[PDB]
Amino acid sequence: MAKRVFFSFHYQDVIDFRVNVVRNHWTKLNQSAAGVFDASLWDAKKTSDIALKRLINGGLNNTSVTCVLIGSQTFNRRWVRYEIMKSIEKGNKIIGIHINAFKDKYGNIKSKGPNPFDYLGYQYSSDGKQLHLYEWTGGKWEEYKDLAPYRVNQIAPESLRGKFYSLSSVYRVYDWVADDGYNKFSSWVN
């Protein structure tokens, strides 16, 4: 039964081609979110970051899995961090996949980039009803500016309140080569 993935990756030529190798493998029952924006139809005054968030949000609403494709600099790119943090709020399943081991035209690869889930985290409020978000930037953990703290529908138990959790303790990260993504990629999403 068909499922749609949101591919979260950052924009760079050296990892766009590696993302396309993954896309070349992901059938009839497999969909992925894709943008369509054309700024000529609509006003540069209105095309701000909230307009960007509205398009990302809407694309995410039609998916149930967010799959973060990890290259060398993915961990610190603004819009990838937003896609991950907004995916948490919407309750998507989230996984990460290292794709730096796809060879370029000279046969080179790159070492694994840092886990983007290591640079993001959250903390429940003292009353257990609000989720506060954080990102690693500027040498310390900053309150996450791109997505404000939000109320959760289920109160957190007191044992979970006031404790910081990095996302790497919550979401699984695969290695395309070591984990045989060629044969097991569908099992990671489904």
């Binding site: 979260s8 000529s40 540069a44």
Partner: protein, 182 residues
């Protein structure tokens, strides 16, 4: 940085031996400005989902500015007009927009380009009572040029032919966007 692909594309153009100066690609003259724009774009934190949106905003803004078009719609407010004229007041932001008199109905000289059957037979003018200038319906105004196909009628003319509208259905879209200038 993310300019390896762009630098490779430029290198492909630069490394060709061109027989004459007229054959050298025009984009090579703008390589440094294009690369500097790509560099800034590449460092703005874009994702795979966000980059095409941002790219479209940037390139459509550049397209407008190169054509001396505004980057948003005309507002039509008092500050938008040039009052240093006697008859026709010109819009400061889209200078092909005029209004005859302070209370005149604004019109756009570039609303219609006529496209004949012959290559390069493209022109502003009057074809069967249809002028290239057309009235704006109102503000905010989003500029748009309609390309209306025409043909030369040598049989039933009124110094050898009369231009005629090829596809009357094309004029229906025009006057859903503008008001007819007569």
């Amino acid at each position: 940085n993310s300019i390896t692909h762009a630098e490779f594309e430029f290198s492909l153009l630069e490394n060709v031996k061109y027989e004459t100066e007229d054959e050298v690609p025009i984009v090579l003259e703008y390589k440094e400005e294009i690369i500097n724009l790509i560099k800034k774009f590449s460092n703005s934190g874009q994702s795979g989902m966000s980059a095409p949106i941002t790219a479209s905003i940037i390139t459509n803004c550049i397209k407008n500015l190169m054509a001396f078009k505004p980057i948003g719609p005309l507002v039509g407010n008092e500050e938008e007009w040039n009052y240093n004229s006697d008859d026709s007041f010109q819009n400061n932001r889209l200078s092909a927009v005029f209004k005859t008199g302070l209370n005149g109905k604004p019109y756009y000289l570039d609303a219609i380009t006529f496209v004949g059957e012959e290559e390069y037979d493209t022109f502003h003018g009057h074809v069967e009572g249809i002028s290239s200038r057309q009235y704006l319906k109102g503000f905010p105004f989003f500029p748009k040029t309609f390309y209306i196909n025409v043909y030369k009628d040598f049989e039933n003319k009124d110094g050898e032919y009369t231009y005629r509208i090829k596809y009357p259905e094309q004029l229906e879209e025009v006057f859903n966007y503008y008001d007819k200038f007569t």
